[PDB]
């Protein structure tokens, strides 16, 4: 119920299902964005995953244990968004990040646009390590989107 | 509300992939609620 991989986060009511986001299972911990689940418990097969840590300002939450993803963008190399859009198979999109320049340092940022339920899709370095999650960002003047590469602290 | 997860794939880098998108350099601020905004 916690095998490594990328997962869709779904909700179902009486009718069908809706994909509200995506997350990463690594080292027995599920990692996603706070705005996807709001820390609600997650069903995985017959099991239940409970929130362990989170931070609304970082827009991150982990389940079952502390945040495990610690790879960092090197500030130089191209990366891949492993986008998992609703209703579409996972696909890798290679890009050279831009930068969010903030008063508290710079953050890599990817100019790729996907539906809201793609939130939490992992961004990867060339070694396949998860350098952050996609889906907390800004809209620029032409209407397109730029997502921070949001990484937690391990 | 039943919130659940389902596997979608293995986390792997794709060799010879589509390189797309630009690399914007933006001045942004982050509020305590986790919202980024452009500095004007």
């Amino acid at each position: 119920e916690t095998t490594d991989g990328v997962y869709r986060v779904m909700t179902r009511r009486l009718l069908g299902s809706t994909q509200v986001g995506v997350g990463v299972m690594q080292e027995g911990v599920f990692h996603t964005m706070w705005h996807v689940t709001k820390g609600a418990a997650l069903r995985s097969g017959e099991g239940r995953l409970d929130p362990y840590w989170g931070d609304v300002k970082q827009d991150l939450v982990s389940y079952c244990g502390p945040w495990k993803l610690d790879a960092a963008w090197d500030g130089l190399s191209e990366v891949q968004l492993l986008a998992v859009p609703p209703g579409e198979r996972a696909k890798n999109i290679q890009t050279l990040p831009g930068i969010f320049k903030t008063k508290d340092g710079d953050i890599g940022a990817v100019a790729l646009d996907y539906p809201a339920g793609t939130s939490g899709s992992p961004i990867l370095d060339k070694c396949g390590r998860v350098i952050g999650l996609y889906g907390n960002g800004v809209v620029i003047k032409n209407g397109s989107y730029v997502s921070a590469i949001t990484q937690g602290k391990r | 509300v039943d919130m659940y997860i389902e596997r979608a794939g293995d986390i792997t880098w794709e060799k010879d992939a589509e390189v797309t998108g630009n690399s914007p350099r933006l001045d942004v601020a982050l509020d305590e609620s986790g919202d980024f905004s452009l500095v004007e």
Partner: peptide
């Protein structure tokens, strides 16, 4: 776009 959370900012489709």
């Amino acid at each position: 776009k959370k900012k489709x």
